[PDB]
């Protein structure tokens, strides 16, 4: 029972990915301190790809081709996932992707554990409009995830007679110059909501810069599908507060499942790793890989795959399951609002988990 | 009634795209020599983007932003389509894409007139295996269409217990060196079928090179989803013959609809433009844009769009229609085999047009 962990320790998204790696290590901790799997311990491998799609492919290639790894948990940014995908498909291996993403992709060797657009973007557009206004400006990092995410958010805003004023992109490793010319464009647009697909390090700098250009008084909230407690941990409470995020989970949800997961994260994560919805996704997907294998009684991919879709996990977010029709997950969706003191204050929560529909045709979408 | 035509006159795919532009010009010829549309003539615009995704975006931007064009027919290579897409979506314009492509994309402003994977790749994999063998080697040009097409063909081959030996990519503007190292890899692989996603100019050079490395006697056939009469026109009959292609149409089909389209193409295309299935797709989609507008009685996009999905065209290939659930087309699928004298000899034909399913989940696929 060998498991490969593809999560950055350095790079643009080092903080979020460390949060993910740890939720994964914790799932294996408990799966092991439960007799392991087959009385044999599940052992993990880690390599820091530093958020580079070529080092992710190389690392995947080394884990698979040399270490005989057939099961992996990892990747956050979409281009890095796409770089590893050919590798896992050739090798008949399996990869669990614990991150929200743009949709429009299918692979029999990848289990998608974060929300497709219909699970986060769809509920969010309805909440933003029918709560803030209809004018929005998009700002994203310059790669496939923001671009594709804004393509679909384009469609959603129109469907609800909203207006997309601008669509701005900044480098993943942005200079203050970029950040300044961008915020200026956001400032002058006069929008009611700023939709952010800025990931990693630039996230907190973006947020603070917008706050700082606005100064005293009313500035649009920043909505995001990625900002979590990890990025939030890097901002000042007045910069953080009021910002909106949709995630199938937050560290502060009421329930016994959340608290158990939490008080446990607190007793295992190192001080530089934070509890986020993405660590939560890497945690439940890692359990399931365990459970499926106990049930299959083996560490063969076919053996484990057949059981993957028949195990329902009672994850810290709510019950979860993986659809066999597209390899995506039934996930909850929560729209939280950050506190003046930095806590995510859930404002809305989906009545039940949303089934995944990766090919997002907006008119065929349920309307929140 | 102004129509923008985005088709290359020069570049890697100049020959195929010229074939497409002409089928489009011919549709407008007849639509005009029928009283036009509203007694007013439909006039077209053309600009040569030379197969460069940045010149396609620029040209689209100029047609739209300066010439007030809201309707366009154009693009062949997927990256060029993706480059124009943001432009048409912002501008609320409409684009008809008369080309086969990789799937996994949706836009409310793009009408897909060529086959998604389930309409060409799916029937083909079954015909290749259950007729040639199970060992195949993939060779594609180096861009998003071949890569994504081979991703799905990967899945299809496995589903039918076939074996994908190698996956080779060559530049769109390849040097003989590349072509030689590639064919060597194809030669040594010992496959029963070579699946080609090589487009434009390199196509005929690839085909001939493979023939020439093989010499006398048994060499695998080259299957393709793109090779047409335009590329075929550039090869020697012994290099061309035996090669396999799946297209919803061929110039030589038996019917009265094909012959009418054909004898007509012959009296309008200039000698350097050939009759292909892609000129056929640009032709029916251009009629429909006409028809929808007569019916809507106007050249407003909303007006025309509402009628788009209610008109059934009796296209040269068979009856066609555009699905409102995903903007793709019900298309026929034919598997032809080239003559020792260069004619596409249909070998199989789908019992009815295949409905489009752009999000290709192979197990949920009908099995041919």
Q: Give DSSP secondary structure letters for A273-323.
A: ----HHHHHHHHHHHHHHHHHHHHTS--HHHHHHHHTT--EEETTEEEEE-
Instruction: Give B299 to chain A, closest Cα distance, Å.
Output: 21
Q: Locate tokens 């047409």: which residue?
A: B228
B364 interface with A at CB cutoff 8 Å: yes
Residues of A in contact with B360 (CB under 8 A): 106
Dist. CA A137–CA A145, nearest whole Å: 17
Dist. CA A356–CA A333, nearest whole Å: 12
CA-to-CA dists, residue A233 to A26, A336, A338, angstroms: 21, 16, 12
Q: Locate tokens 């090869």: which residue?
A: B235
Dist. CA A217–CA B285, nearest whole Å: 53
Question: Which of B155, B326, B361 is facing A361, going by the closest CB pair?
Answer: B326
A104 interface with B at CB cutoff 8 Å: yes
Q: A166 in helix, strand or coil?
A: strand
Pairing of strands B2-6, B43-47: parallel
Dist. CA A26–CA A286, nearest whole Å: 9
Question: Which of B108, B154, B325 is facing A155, going by the closest CB pair?
Answer: B108
Dist. CA B329–CA B354, nearest whole Å: 9
Phi, psi values for residue A240, rounded to 5°: -75, -50
Instruction: Give B66 to chain A, closest Cα distance, Å.
Output: 20
Dist. CA B313–CA B282, nearest whole Å: 13
Overall size of chain A counted in residues: 368
Contacts of B217 by beta carbon, 8 Å cutoff, 6+ apart: none
| CB-CB contact of B72 with B97 (8 Å) | no
Query: How crowded is residue B53: how many other Cβ atoms within 10 Å of its Cβ?
Result: 18
The tokens describing A58, both together, are 């190389």
| CB-CB contact of A293 with A299 (8 Å) | yes
Q: A184 in helix, strand or coil?
A: helix
| CB-CB contact of B320 with B355 (8 Å) | no
Q: What is the DSSP letter of B178?
A: H
Contacts of B185 by beta carbon, 8 Å cutoff, 6+ apart: B137, B166, B168
Return the residue of A nearest to B166 by Cα. Answer: A90
Residues of B in contact with A167 (CB under 8 A): 86
Dist. CA B205–CA A333, nearest whole Å: 53
CA B97 to the chain's CA centroid: 9
The tokens describing A143, both together, are 């790669």
Strand partners, A262: none
Phi, psi values for residue A73, rounded to 5°: -120, 135
Checking B42-46 for CB contacts under 8 A at 24+ apart, the result is: B42/B1, B42/B2, B42/B3, B42/B290, B43/B1, B43/B2, B43/B3, B44/B2, B44/B3, B44/B4, B44/B5, B45/B2, B45/B3, B45/B4, B45/B5, B45/B69, B46/B4, B46/B5, B46/B7, B46/B21
| CB-CB contact of A340 with A238 (8 Å) | yes
Dist. CA A26–CA A361, nearest whole Å: 37
Return the residue of A nearest to B164 by Cα. Answer: A90
Contacts of B23 by beta carbon, 8 Å cutoff, 6+ apart: B98, B265, B278, B279, B280, B281, B282, B283, B286
Contacts of A189 by beta carbon, 8 Å cutoff, 6+ apart: A135, A137, A165, A166
β strands within chain B, DSSP E: 2-6, 43-47, 71-74, 94-97, 110-112, 135-141, 163-170, 193-197, 222-224, 244-247, 313-315, 318-322, 329-330, 334-338, 344-349
Question: Which of B90, B358, B364 is facing A359, going by the closest CB pair?
Answer: B358
CA-to-CA dists, residue A131 to A14, A57, A134, A217, B123, angstroms: 33, 42, 9, 18, 49
Q: Which one, of B93, B82, B29, lies nearest residue B53 by Cα?
A: B82
A360 interface with B at CB cutoff 8 Å: yes
| CB-CB contact of A207 with A240 (8 Å) | yes
CB contact under 8 A, B359 and A104: yes
Return the residue of B nearest to A151 by Cα. Answer: B86
Q: Which helix (H) or strand (E) holds A347?
A: strand A344-349
The tokens describing B315, both together, are 């296209």
CB contact under 8 A, B89 and A151: yes
Q: Environment class of residue A16 by beta-carbon count within 10 Å: exposed (0-12), middle (13-18) or buried (19+)?
A: buried
Q: B356 in helix, strand or coil?
A: coil
| CB-CB contact of B276 with B230 (8 Å) | yes
Which phi-psi region, left, alpha or beta, contains residue A62 (left: φ > 0; alpha: ψ -120 to 50)? Answer: alpha
Q: Locate tokens 């009796």: which residue?
A: B314
**Domains identified in chain A and CATH numbers:** 1-115+255-331 (3.40.50.2300), 116-254+332-368 (3.40.50.2300)
Overall size of chain B counted in residues: 368
The tokens describing A126, both together, are 């309805």
Q: Which helix (H) or strand (E) holds B230?
A: helix B229-232
B229 interface with A at CB cutoff 8 Å: no
B169 interface with A at CB cutoff 8 Å: no
CA B340 to the chain's CA centroid: 24
B268 interface with A at CB cutoff 8 Å: no
Q: Which one, of B281, B355, B274, lies nearest residue B316 by Cα?
A: B281
Phi, psi values for residue B89, rounded to 5°: -65, -40
Return the residue of A nearest to B83 by Cα. Answer: A147
A108 interface with B at CB cutoff 8 Å: yes
Question: Which of B89, B359, B363 is facing A358, going by the closest CB pair?
Answer: B359
Question: Within chain B, what is the greatest distance between any pair of CA atoms?
Answer: 62
Dist. CA B59–CA B53, nearest whole Å: 10
Q: A72 in helix, strand or coil?
A: strand
CB contact under 8 A, A151 and B326: no
CB contact under 8 A, B364 and A325: yes
Q: Which residues of chain A from 324 to 353 reach within 8 Å of chain B, CB to CB?
A: 325-326
Residues of B in contact with A359 (CB under 8 A): 104, 106, 326, 358-359
Dist. CA B85–CA B109, nearest whole Å: 8
Structural biology method used: X-ray
Q: Which one, of B243, B245, B163, B179, lies nearest residue B213 by Cα?
A: B179
Strand partners, A193: A136
CB contact under 8 A, A361 and B106: yes
| CB-CB contact of B287 with B31 (8 Å) | yes
Contacts of A302 by beta carbon, 8 Å cutoff, 6+ apart: none
Mutate to test the interface with A, among B93, B106, B107 (most CBs of A within 10 A): B106
Q: Which one, of A99, A37, A15, lies nearest residue A287 by Cα?
A: A37
Strand partners, B193: B136
Q: Quick one: angle between helices A144-159 and A117-129, nearest 10? A: 50
Task: Give me the sign of the Cα torsion angle A316, A318, A324, A327.
Answer: negative
B239 interface with A at CB cutoff 8 Å: no
Dist. CA A164–CA A147, nearest whole Å: 14
B66 interface with A at CB cutoff 8 Å: no
Which phi-psi region, left, alpha or beta, contains residue B99 (left: φ > 0; alpha: ψ -120 to 50)? Answer: beta
Q: Which one, of A130, A187, A116, lies nearest residue A161 by Cα?
A: A130
Strand partners, B272: none
CA B326 to the chain's CA centroid: 18
Q: Locate tokens 């958010």: which residue?
A: A153
Residues of B in contact with A155 (CB under 8 A): 108
Q: B309 in helix, strand or coil?
A: coil
A114 interface with B at CB cutoff 8 Å: no
| CB-CB contact of A180 with A196 (8 Å) | no
Strand partners, A170: A141
**Half-sphere exposure for A56 (CA within 13 Å, toward CB):** 29
* Burial letters A225-237, b for 16+ CB under 10 A, else e: bbbbbbbbebbee
Q: A336 in helix, strand or coil?
A: strand
Dist. CA A46–CA B226, nearest whole Å: 42
Phi, psi values for residue A283, rounded to 5°: -65, -55
Dist. CA B364–CA A325, nearest whole Å: 7
Q: Which helix (H) or strand (E) holds B28?
A: helix B14-32
Dist. CA B320–CA B323, nearest whole Å: 10
Q: Locate tokens 């019916």: which residue?
A: B295
Residues of B in contact with A104 (CB under 8 A): 104-106, 359
CB contact under 8 A, B106 and A108: no
| CB-CB contact of B233 with B16 (8 Å) | no
The tokens describing A141, both together, are 């990092």
Residues of A in contact with B364 (CB under 8 A): 325
Dist. CA B260–CA B317, nearest whole Å: 11
CA-to-CA dists, residue A25 to A41, A137, A304, B111, angstroms: 13, 38, 20, 47
| CB-CB contact of B243 with B224 (8 Å) | yes
| CB-CB contact of A16 with A5 (8 Å) | no
Query: How crowded is residue B348: how many other Cβ atoms within 10 Å of its Cβ?
Result: 16
Strand partners, A95: A72, A110
Residues of B in contact with A364 (CB under 8 A): 325
> Number of Cβ pairs closer than 8 Å across A and B?
44
Instruction: Give B75 to chain A, closest Cα distance, Å.
Output: 19
Residues of B in contact with A85 (CB under 8 A): 151
Dist. CA A88–CA A60, nearest whole Å: 8
**Half-sphere exposure for A66 (CA within 13 Å, toward CB):** 7
CB contact under 8 A, A106 and B364: no
A364 interface with B at CB cutoff 8 Å: yes
Question: Which of B151, B358, B361 is facing A325, going by the closest CB pair?
Answer: B361
Question: Which of A85, A106, A364 is facing B359, going by the closest CB pair?
Answer: A106
Return the residue of A nearest to B109 by Cα. Answer: A155
Query: Percent helix, strand and coil across chain A, each rounded to 5?
Result: 40, 20, 40
Task: Give me the sign of the Cα torsion angle A341, A347, A350, A351.
Answer: positive
Which DSSP string do the residues of A17-36 spell out, in sequence order? Answer: HHHHHHHHHHHHHHHHTTTT
CB contact under 8 A, B104 and A104: yes
CB contact under 8 A, B361 and A151: no
């Amino acid at each position: 029972p060998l498991i490969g962990l593809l999560f950055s320790e350095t790079g643009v998204t080092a903080d979020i990915e460390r949060s993910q790696r740890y939720g994964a290590l914790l799932a294996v901790e408990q799966l092991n301190r439960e007799g392991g799997v087959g009385g044999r311990p599940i052992e993990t491998l880690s390599q820091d790809p530093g958020g580079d799609p070529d080092r992710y492919r190389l690392c995947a290639e080394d884990f698979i081709r040399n270490r005989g790894v057939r099961f992996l948990v990892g990747c956050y940014m979409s281009h890095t996932r796409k770089a590893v995908m050919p590798v896992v498909e050739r090798a008949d291996a399996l990869l669990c992707y614990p991150t929200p993403y743009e949709g429009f992709e299918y692979s029999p060797n990848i289990v998608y554990g974060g929300p497709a657009p219909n699970q986060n973007s769809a509920p969010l557009a309805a909440y933003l409009i029918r709560h803030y206004g209809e004018r929005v400006v998009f700002i994203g990092s310059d790669y496939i995830y923001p671009r594709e995410s804004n393509h679909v958010m384009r469609h959603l805003y129109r469907q609800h007679g909203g207006t997309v004023l601008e669509e701005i992109y900044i480098p993943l490793y942005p200079s203050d110059d970029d950040l300044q010319r961008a915020v200026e464009r956001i400032y002058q647009a006069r929008a009611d909501v700023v939709f952010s697909t800025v990931v990693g390090t630039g996230t907190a700098e973006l947020y603070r810069a917008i706050a700082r250009r606005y100064g005293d008084g009313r500035r649009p909230p920043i909505a995001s599908l990625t900002t979590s407690e990890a990025e939030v941990a890097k901002m000042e409470s007045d910069v953080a507060e009021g910002q909106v995020v949709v995630a199938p989970y937050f560290s502060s949800i009421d329930t016994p499942a959340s608290r158990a997961f939490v008080q446990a994260c607190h007793g295992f994560f190192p001080e530089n790793a934070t509890i986020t919805a993405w660590a939560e996704a890497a945690y439940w997907q890692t359990l399931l890989l365990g459970r499926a294998a106990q049930a299959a009684g083996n560490w063969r991919v076919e053996d484990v795959q057949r059981h993957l879709y028949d195990i329902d996990i009672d994850a810290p977010q709510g019950p979860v399951r993986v659809e066999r029709q597209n390899n995506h997950s039934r996930l909850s969706s929560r729209i939280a609002e950050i506190d003046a003191r930095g806590v995510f204050q859930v404002r809305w929560q989906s009545p039940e988990p949303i089934r995944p529909d990766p090919y997002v045709v907006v008119h065929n979408l349920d309307d929140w």
